[PDB]
Amino acid sequence: AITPMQVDDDEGREYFVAFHGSRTFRDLKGDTAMLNANREARPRDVSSNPLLQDGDLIYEGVIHREVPEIDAWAAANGFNTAGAGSAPIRPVFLCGTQSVFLAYAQRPQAGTEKSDIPALNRRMTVGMDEIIGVKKAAFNGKQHGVVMGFFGAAGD
C-alpha cells in the first residue's frame, strides 16, 4: 500500500499530490467539463480563486501542482515521439509519502582564493562544494510511493 499524505479516518479522506509538466496541466484545468467546479463551488472572492488567478487546484482529494521543468526533461528523453502513431506524450507523477530519499553529507559551502599572486591581485577564484545523494525509494523491485501515468499531450 502507498501511504497517503493526509488521512481522515472518519468520512474517509486520502490525499495525494500530482506533479504535472504544464502540457498536461493546461488540459486538466481547461477541459469543457470539470471547469465549473471551481466557479460554482468556490466562494465569490477574487483574490483566492484559481480560475481568475491561476495556481494549484484540488479536485476529488488530489492536489495538482505544476512543475514547468518536466517539459525540459521529457523532451530530451524522446517523449515528443513514441506514442500511438508517433504522437507526443508526457508523464504525470502521482506520489504519496516517502517516495524519494535525500541523504545529506555536507551542506553547500562557499570559498574564495587569490590565485596568481596575493600581492599583485591579478586573479581570483570563487567556488562552492556539496556532498549529496538523491534516489527514488525502491523496495523489492517496486516503486514505494509513486504512480506514473502517461497521457497524450498534443502541445498545440
Place this chain on the structure above:
Amino acid sequence: AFSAANPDRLFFGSISGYSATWATGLGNVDAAETCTAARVGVMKRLAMSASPAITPMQVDDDEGREYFVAFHGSRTFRDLKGDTAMLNANREARPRDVSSNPLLQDGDLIYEGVIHREVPEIDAWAAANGFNTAGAGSAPIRPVFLCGTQSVFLAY
C-alpha cells in the same frame, strides 16, 4: 531570421502551425482560430518555459503566482470577453456589486493570472501593415502582445 531564432516566443494560430519562414507561419492561422480564453493560457505557458526566462510582473513564491499583462487591439478583445464559455467567470465569481463589475461596466479583466488591457490603436497600426489579409485563405489576423517586465527601453 526573426523566426527560427525565437521558436519559444512566437505563437501563431497553434503550436502545430509554427514555421521557420515568416510568410508561411502567418498562413497557418485560420479565421476560425479566434482568441478564446483557452488559447491565451497557451501564451502564458510559453512565457513560463522560455529558454532565457521572462521575468513576470509580480511573483508570489508560496501558492505560486506569476502575473503578466496582455495588450489587445479591440478585435481580439471582444472575442475574449464575449465567448460563450468563460463569461460566467465574472458574473458567478465576482461580488454582487454594480459599480465594480466589468460585465456591466467594461474595462480590463483578469483571468488565470494574466491582465487583459485594451489598446484601441493597434487596429490602426496593424491595418496599415497588411494584416487585413495574409492569413489562411486571406483572412484578417491581429497581433496580441503578452509582455512581462523590461520589454521596451526608453532613453530620455
